[PDB]
Design a binder for these strands. Structure first.
Lengths: 60, 45
RNA sequence: AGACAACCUGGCGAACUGAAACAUCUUAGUAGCCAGAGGAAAAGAAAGCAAAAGCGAUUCCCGUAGUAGCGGCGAGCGAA
RNA sequence: AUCCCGUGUGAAUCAGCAAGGACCACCUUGCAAGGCUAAAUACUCCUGGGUGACCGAUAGCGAAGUAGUACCGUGAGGGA
RNA sequence: AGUGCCGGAAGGUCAAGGAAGUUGGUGACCUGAUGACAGGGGAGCCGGCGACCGAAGCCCCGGUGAACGGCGGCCGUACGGUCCUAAGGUAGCGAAAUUCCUUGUCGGGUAAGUUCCGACCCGCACGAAAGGCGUAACGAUCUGGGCACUGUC
RNA sequence: UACUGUUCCCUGGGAUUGGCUUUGGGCUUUUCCUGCGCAGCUUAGGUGGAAGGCGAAGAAGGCCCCCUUCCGGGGGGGCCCGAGCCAUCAGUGAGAUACCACUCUGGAAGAGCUAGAAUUCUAACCUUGUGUCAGGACCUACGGGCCAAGGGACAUUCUCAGGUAGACAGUUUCUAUGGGGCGUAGGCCUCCCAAAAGGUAACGGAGGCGUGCAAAGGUUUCCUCGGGCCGGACGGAGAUUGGCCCUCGAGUGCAAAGGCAGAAGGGAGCUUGACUGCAAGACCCACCCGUCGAGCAGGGACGAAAGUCGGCCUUAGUGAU
C-alpha cells in the first residue's frame, strides 16, 4: 500500500446499455505512487467505444 | 422458532380458579393431558 | 422351530489398495458377519416418460456412449 | 431438482394436489401418503441326455487305494 | 511472571435460534419508439441482506508451589557500586552412581596404589518430598583393606 | 503447544413441559406535558391550516396544596370571586401551545403486545420404603398393583448449536550432500571460471533482485561534464565567481557488464503513444515460457516541416493450472 495499480475508467462512455452496438465502458489499469501524487489522476487517452480520445477519470 | 399450544377445552367440574362447568376458554395441552383428562374434569372440542 | 452348494432380499459394514505421499475422493456399499425365503428372488400396473410430436406396469439383452455430465475439474466415476 | 430419513413444525382435496433439474408465470403429464401379481432374468451341493484341437497319476477335484483319511494342533484350523 | 488448577463483578469477544426493516425474481394491469422487444409493475408466491436480543468458553480480576516448573550477570576494595529478573539457591552436602579439564591437590593406607578412606571447594552441570542430610540392623548388593587358607601362580 | 477429526464433559435453542401470582424490561396506539448559549414581558425543537379564538358549554385577579424545577418561573385540583382575557404591534436567525395541521427531543395514566424474572404449587418427569397387596404358597428374592414420602417442570432422555482432554483415531513430518546428521543452499540478473561462435559443471571465485519514476515517460528546443592550477571578503584540502589546462577519467534512481557527445549525460516549453485493432518476419529453445519487430488501420501528441512516440540506455523487479 505504497505504490499502487489504479482504475482509470472513462468520463467518455459513462455507463449506458441498449441498442445492439453496446456502449460498454472502456478502462485502463496502471500504476501511480499514492504518496507522491495524492490527488487522483486525470489523463487523456483513446477509448475504442467513443472512437475519440477522451478524458479517463480516476476512481478507487 | 417456538410455537404456543392452544387447545379447545370444555369443562365439567367447577375448577378452583377459572371454571364454570361450561367454559369454552383455551389453554396449553399440559393442562388437559397431565392434570384434567386423567381425573375426568374436562373434554376436547 | 432346524438343515440347505451357489443365486437372491433385508440389517450392519471394513482395510490393504489407487490417487505415484495423503485427509476430500477411490477401493465399495465390495469382502466379511447377521437375519430371511424361493425355485428363482426382487421389482411392478404411473402423483411415470417426453415435448408441443408423441408413449403407455415391470424385468432382461443390443444400443445410444465411454456421449451428456460429476470430479482436491486430480485419480477417477459416468447416465437417461 | 427428483427419492428417502432423525429433530421440530405442519397444508389442500380435484375453482384441488404433485411433476416437468432452483425459482415464478403459462401450458402438458399424472394422480403420492392401502395392498397382490406369471413370464422373459440370476445360479449349480445336484439328476438325466449329449459334446470336447480337455487331463491321464508331479496332470485332473485335496482326494483313480475303505481321504478330508494318516498325521499335526488345547482350539479354531491345517493336511499328505 | 509463564503454564496448570481453583474461584470472580462490569466491559469486550461470542453459535445455533429468533427478529424491526431493506433489496431482488416472477406477474394481472397501464404504457413506448422503430425494430422485433422494453418501461414499469397491485395481490399472491418465491429467494437473498439483517438494527436489536443471545450462554458457556476466551481475554480480563484474585488465589494457589509435598501444583508443571524455575532458583542471575558485570566491575571495584569479608565490603561496596551497577544492571537485569517472577525470583536470584536458605539449611545441608560436595571432585560424589553427579567432576568434562583429571591419575585435581593435600593427608592416611602399601616397598610401590589412574581403584580405596578423610579433608579442601576452581559444584563444566548437588540441593530440600522427580525430597535434603544422617542412621542401628538386614544384602546370593556394589566397592577397598586385613587374618586364616590353599596348584590361582 | 504437528494437521485433521472422534469421544468424555460443559453450555445455549427446541421436544418431554404445566399453573398461577408481584416487579420493571422492550415495542405499538390513545392523550398529556416537556424541552431557560444570545434578543429578553418569553424554564421557545423544526415547521404550518392563516388572523379571531374563547367567554355566562358559570370568567380576570387570588386562597392553599399538588406536578415539574438547568430554582428562571412554568403548569394545575377545587372555589370565595363573578363573565373577561386579548393575535399581528416593539425586541429575534423563528413566531406567539388565541384555534389547529404534522413531527424531533424527553417523559406521565390507561390499553394491547410479548419477553425476563424469583418464589411456590403439583398433575408430567425423577427417586424411596424389614408400608401394605396377593396364585395351591413365598417377594426382608428381582420386579408388578395400591396408598404413600422426598424432589420437582428443574433434572434425566432425543435432536440442533458453540466450547472443551493425545483419552482415542487416521496421517503428515522435502531434496541437495564428496556416507548420514549438524550447518549451508533451493527462484531470477551481472561478471569471472568458460578454453577469442553459442553452450558448459563443482558445497568454484565475486556481487545484486523480489523495484522506482505522473516524471527519472513522449516529443520540441537549448547546454557540456568531472579533476586540478592561478586570482579573489569571511573561506580552509573543499561551498560561491573568474580565467587556464588534460579533454570524457563525470554522470547515467538501485549490482555488475556492455553502452552513451554537442549524446542515452544536464536544463527548459508543451503534453500523455505508460493507446485500440493487428502484424510479414526472425531469435531462444525437450516441453511449458521468453524476446526483437518493418509495416498497415484508426484516432491523437509534439514540430514550421521532414519526422519521432504502442513506457523507461539495455540486461533483474517474478509464478503455470
Amino acid at each position: 500500500d505504497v505504490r499502487v495499480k489504479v482504475i482509470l475508467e472513462c468520463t467518455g462512455c459513462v455507463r449506458k446499455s441498449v441498442n445492439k452496438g453496446s456502449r460498454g465502458v472502456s478502462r485502463y489499469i496502471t500504476q501511480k505512487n499514492r504518496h507522491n501524487t495524492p490527488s487522483r489522476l486525470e489523463l487523456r487517452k483513446f477509448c475504442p467505444y467513443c472512437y475519440k480520445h477522451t478524458i479517463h477519470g480516476e476512481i478507487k | 422458532k417456538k410455537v404456543k399450544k392452544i387447545r379447545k377445552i370444555i369443562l365439567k367440574e367447577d375448577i378452583p380458579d377459572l371454571g364454570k362447568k361450561g367454559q369454552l376458554l383455551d389453554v396449553r395441552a399440559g393442562f388437559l393431558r397431565n392434570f384434567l383428562l386423567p381425573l375426568g374434569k374436562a373434554e376436547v372440542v
